[PDB]
Amino acid sequence: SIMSYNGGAVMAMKGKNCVAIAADRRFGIQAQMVTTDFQKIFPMGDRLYIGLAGLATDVQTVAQRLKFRLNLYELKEGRQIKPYTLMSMVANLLYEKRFGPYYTEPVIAGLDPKTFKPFICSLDLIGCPMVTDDFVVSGTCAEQMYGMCESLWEPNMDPDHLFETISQAMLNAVDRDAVSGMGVIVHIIEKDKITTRTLKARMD
Amino acid sequence: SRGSSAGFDRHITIFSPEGRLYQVEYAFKAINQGGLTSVAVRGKDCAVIVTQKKVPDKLLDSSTVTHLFKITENIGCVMTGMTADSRSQVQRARYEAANWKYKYGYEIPVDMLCKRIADISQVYTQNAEMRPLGCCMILIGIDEEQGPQVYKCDPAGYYCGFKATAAGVKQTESTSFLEKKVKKKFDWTFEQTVETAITCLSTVLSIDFKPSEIEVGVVTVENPKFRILTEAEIDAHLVALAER
Amino acid sequence: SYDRAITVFSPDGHLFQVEYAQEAVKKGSTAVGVRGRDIVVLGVEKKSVAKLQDERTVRKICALDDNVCMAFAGLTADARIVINRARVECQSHRLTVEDPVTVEYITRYIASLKQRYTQSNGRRPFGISALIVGFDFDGTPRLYQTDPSGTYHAWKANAIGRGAKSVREFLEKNYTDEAIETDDLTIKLVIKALLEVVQSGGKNIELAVMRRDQSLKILNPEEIEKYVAEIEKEKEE
Amino acid sequence: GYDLSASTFSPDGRVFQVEYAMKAVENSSTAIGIRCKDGVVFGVEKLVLSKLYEEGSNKRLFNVDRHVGMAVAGLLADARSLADIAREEASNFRSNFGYNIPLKHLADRVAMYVHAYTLYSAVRPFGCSFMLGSYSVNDGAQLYMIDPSGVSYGYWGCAIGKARQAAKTEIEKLQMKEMTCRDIVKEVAKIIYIVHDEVKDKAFELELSWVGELTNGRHEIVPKDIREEAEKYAKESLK
Amino acid sequence: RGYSFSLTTFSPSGKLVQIEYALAAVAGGAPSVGIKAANGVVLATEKKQKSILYDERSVHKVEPITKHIGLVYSGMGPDYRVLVHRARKLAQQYYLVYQEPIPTAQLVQRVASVMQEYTQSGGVRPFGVSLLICGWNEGRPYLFQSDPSGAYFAWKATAMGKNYVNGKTFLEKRYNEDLELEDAIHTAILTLKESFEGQMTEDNIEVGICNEAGFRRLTPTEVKDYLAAI
Amino acid sequence: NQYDNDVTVWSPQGRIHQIEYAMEAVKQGSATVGLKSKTHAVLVALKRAQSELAAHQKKILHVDNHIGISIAGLTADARLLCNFMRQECLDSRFVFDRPLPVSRLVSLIGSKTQIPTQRYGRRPYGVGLLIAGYDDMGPHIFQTCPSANYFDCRAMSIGARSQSARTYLERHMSEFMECNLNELVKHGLRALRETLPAEQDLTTKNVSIGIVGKDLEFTIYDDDDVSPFLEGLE
């Protein structure tokens, strides 16, 4: 499967006035780990991030081509992009390649730049959007991820509880997947700050 | 200003120093080269087009001399001005309507067909390499909500719907005659529509027609298909008028 | 796309655009080249001066590759297009031959570009002449000149731009085995040649040298006014 | 000046380039067509500019489809090009719709092509006028004429070229609706001889073609023996 | 083929005279007015409506671009229809990508850019129109003008067409920042009455409004009502 | 005047000055003659020599086994047209396995050469051709013009002082049909000789001959090969 050639996992999760996005850190080629600090989550604004799992080359291309488009948008428009609008931009970028797609399935996490309302979504590889009020997951251990999220997530979590929930959902999910892990990074996004953590995690 | 000219502003469609388009103005003069006048009038029940039919040459097959044209089953037109230009514009109208029906699944509204031809004419006023068409198109049809319609478009790409209108050599005089007659009428609307059209034409030309010297086309709410009157039919209107 | 024939013949065989391009070159700043024994030197006038200018941003001497550079006179925007085209071509040559270009090869390429812009629809000629210098793989030093027509020749020394006629006259009289025996004298010949025409000598001569294998060195004002004094005090005697 | 391009109107609303092209047709010698009871007959006064030319050289009568003749006046290279356009149009119509192109439609299609050369600086108007004639049991006899502006009309009788008016006045004397093609050919020849200026232009060939019940709806040259009899009748009638 | 050279060029004095001359066609056009109130925008225009024979309802000068944006103009009607059509198409292109209605200013920028093209591109003249574009977005009204050069400007109130210089001084001495939309409609109609000639009816002027609820033309009957006071 | 620079500009007399000017290129060429009998078609051409040490310009060109041409006017236009004709001939043998009938090829020339007379920025062809051929309808001589008109000829001459050659041909044309080949070429030569200044004569250096007929593929005779035909101009 093309989508598992590199492995990997991303998820995002909503809390009260905050959101969280997380990723594993492995870059590997089939069985072989190549590196353990591969970036999968990219800033698209002060309070808006995009996470991409799938084929590593397309993770990087999509992140780069998206940034190109976003930077032009923000220069032309007055302003920082709204989360929902970023989703749409990404959908349109992915659907242009409807018949030779990028092999990546992003998640977006952020706060509205004016209202600070939490937003999360995911898209499939041809740009179908899906907004939720709880969580989204994408990657080679999506079942594992769903099982952890369904069981642990609760509404209206504070930043500390959100951080523990998303961390426990990722660590435990990837530990049942041969081709995801080698570390976990977590960004908690709040109105007044971003908190970035790497987790103590299995390295096998 | 007051008739000023710079550079090539009388040869191609660029602006003159007053902001005029002389080439477009000249296309309106081309409409009169033909020597003909057309009239169109709408009432609550029908819309009518009347034009002069001049067959100076005996050797013409007079059945092939017309300025009335079916665009679709339900849309008719009278063309005034340069004949070959007119025919071209009729073909384009037929194409636009047929295309509209294929794409959208219902017949093109008369207003939309008129707008489309006028938009195509607009392009000739802004691009330098071709001339405008020296002709004017008047369309009639029944709209299901608004009733009988008369629309006109011109070589500037202007268009408008009307209670009545005219084109060609005696356009101004026709317009005067029709205005004077609608003001008189309650709720400013024509009722005897074929008679008004023929009468208008006869007054402004001072002719008193034979039935072979005009053509008449109609659409009605009861019978929306565009129809061309025969000579005998036209004669019945001429005789009914002559007798009061 | 615009296909007007721009350069056409006139009665008596003139190509007026090309002649007008040459007039543009004649109003450019003077440029001078001398071919030494084992050095080649380029010097060029002015152009404006102006204390508020960042000097680095307006040089008229340009590396094409490691072993070839050029000066130009005429329309500076036109020159930049020619220079970039030649820089691309130097990298194709290396790509497909695995040798650097000869100076003649790249000159011939530039000249042929210039000629094409005198015979293609929709374009005007380049309003520049170039002096192109360097060394061939075997160590031979070279100086070529191109003009708007696409004509090119090799020279021992030459000037282009305003005052080329008198600078060329001066070179014809002063270019000898003795004036180019050494590096310093070759350089001092170029400066003397400029210092003839250069308004507030000098001040605003820009100058560069190329040695066999050693790549383009541009001189700085401190190193230039050393040569100036070293020639001016010799002319008192 | 306002008369250099077909994309420029004059201040009075004329397109002089089209008018000038019409002058080229009007300098040409005369062609006529006559529709009658059972067909259409064409005649051309074909000026012979050198005795070195073969009989038949520079024909002005063409077959454009098996049922359709074309008769031309004006610049002959332009006319031939139009005959090729007419041919291609008739051919394409048969391929697409599967039956012989109706005369009127063919006339209208070629007329729009002519018309397209009256709008633009990029091209010039055709210096030719031409008649199209056909006959079938279903459509009867039909005769159309198309000029450089692209106008197309149907006729009982028609003439183009420099003695147009003199020809028309002679055509008007015939009751053509009641005559047959065999009677009309003689009258065509007669009229060409009447309008021919024997002083100013010395030598001509009469060219004759027809399409009618008698040719079964095929456009054909008038047979040699019938042409010669018609010439002899025209010549003696001139007396 | 198409002429590939510019029909607008620099004169010796640095002027693009075809664009000036386009502006003279605008100045001779029928008057248009736009006023930005605190809570909305009004656009108003005179119909150059000769004849009682015209069906006034058959073509409109005040036109919707989107649910939240509308336009009017002074100058050449057929040129305006081109720009209305492109503006609509631009707005939809934006909506397909971003899934949000085009901000008024973005719509103005893209339309203005089209107008700029027609000042340089081959074988064409500039548009002989100036546009007044109103909209509401980010909880706030916008009024913009776009001219035949492709320059645009944001206004609180302005006038274009015949007698616009006077119209502008009439609005200077009459607009205030805290004015309501209904009052603004009244002052817009008075600004047209300054240069009218002919006695105003609800059939020979056309009025459009823009607020939080969206852009729409006022109906004949609504215009009639505002006209009683005037 | 304002009417003479563009092939797309009709004059107020219904003329196209660019086409008339193109025809002057043929009138200034050296003269050539074409004539036919029942069985053969012959071309005879005068070759102009730049200097006394130049060969003399080719006037006669092979098109196909059954077709050859003689040219007058711009030589580069002549080659362009000749290459078109050649290609049309090859196409017909490839497709149909038979020679392209001569009258059809001439039609194709008319259609091809008309096109640039009607488009802006194009020009007429500045060449006239005499075309000699032989097919199922026997021998032919055709003439083609820069106007794109063409003519079917009993005989013809184009080029400088060709009026004289035309007069001679009218004078003797009733003899041509029944002539044997030697007789017919002699007639072509005598006609061509009328175009010359009275001093000067036909020589092996200035005459070129082309012949095709029933028994004979298109063949060109130059230099020493014209001598048999030149002797016994008796």
Place this chain on the structure above:
Amino acid sequence: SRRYDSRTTIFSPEGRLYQVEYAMEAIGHAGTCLGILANDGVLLAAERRNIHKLLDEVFFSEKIYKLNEDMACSVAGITSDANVLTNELRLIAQRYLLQYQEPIPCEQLVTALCDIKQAYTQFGGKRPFGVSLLYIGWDKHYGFQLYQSDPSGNYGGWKATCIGNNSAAAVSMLKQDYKEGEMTLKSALALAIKVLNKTMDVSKLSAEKVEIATLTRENGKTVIRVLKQKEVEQLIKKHEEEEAKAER
């Protein structure tokens, strides 16, 4: 059609390009626009032409454009033309960033645009763009930079300059007051106001009539700000206090 082609891309008899010159006349009549380089930053100051009372004030400037993270520009000349060019600058700067994953160096962006301008003088038969631009920026190769381009496709780097109305006069005053290697943003600001005060001699200078943007570096990041009207009046005040000192 040869009759109507005004031949925008040909040489005149002295080797000149008339359109380019004529476009340069358009610029010389547009709003004065100056650029001044300092040790800690770079600035742009421009005369506003959008000054009628009824204008609305909707963007953060009239003639100052952000190009990318590290660069801005101002313009003098045909506004609509300036909008095309600034849009193109932003595109070029993103193309680079996409390809190399670092910001386009200032001189490279200017040169890329200038090559487009040059093309328009050499082929295609179109009128050139009637725009001159001043570009301010920081990059990691040459730090704080100021460039100027014009419709010939020519450009240069400057420590201070001016385009638009009264350019010559503005450059004279710059030549005299500008201290090479010793300017601060605060003293460049004072000088900008001094210069505009002289060169807007129709008439008495006011904050509503000028726009000033600064480009500085703070914590390894470029900051590009358009000064608010409070700050502009304060600088005008300070300059007017300063001229009171001028005699005694």
Place this chain on the structure above:
Amino acid sequence: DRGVNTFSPEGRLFQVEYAIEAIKLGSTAIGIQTSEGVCLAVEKRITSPLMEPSSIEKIVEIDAHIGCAMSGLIADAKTLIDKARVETQNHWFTYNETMTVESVTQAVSNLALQFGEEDADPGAMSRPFGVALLFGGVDEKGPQLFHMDPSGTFVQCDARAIGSASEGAQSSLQEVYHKSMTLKEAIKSSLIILKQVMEEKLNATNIELATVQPGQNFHMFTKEELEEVIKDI
């Protein structure tokens, strides 16, 4: 002003006529064809002692059996010379044989009227070539000299001059040429004639000379070989 493909009332293309006049601004070149080979000689026209004479190349090798001398606007000649070179190599590639002098000349001359501004590719030729050419070589017809000018007209010549003094030089050529003349005689004759017509004193650096002979390939004369010939003259 009119288009590049406009005919004059005399039936000539203005641009071509004007291009023929540009040939008169060139230096003189001479070609002579003998039964022992052909020679090509050309005046260099040195304008400054600082110019390198060897960088003036007005005689070029087309192939081993074919040289070419040019006069007129020399920069224009480059695409013509390259077309001739490519054509002879294509012919060798396809047919494994040398291309005739006539055929080469024909191929090049087919470019001559391929200019104009609304038939052609986005930036095709805008004007004719301001160049005349002498192709001298040996093929199975024996030695051969052909001339071509900007009209695309080409013809074999026994001897021909082109450029500024061609009238003059052509007269002296009629005077001295004979069919049975040796190659050495033709070499002397063309240097004697260049010497008359040249504004500067003839010497071994301000002329070039090449031959082609049935024996032997295209050969450019060295300084030393010129000096030897120049002694008698």
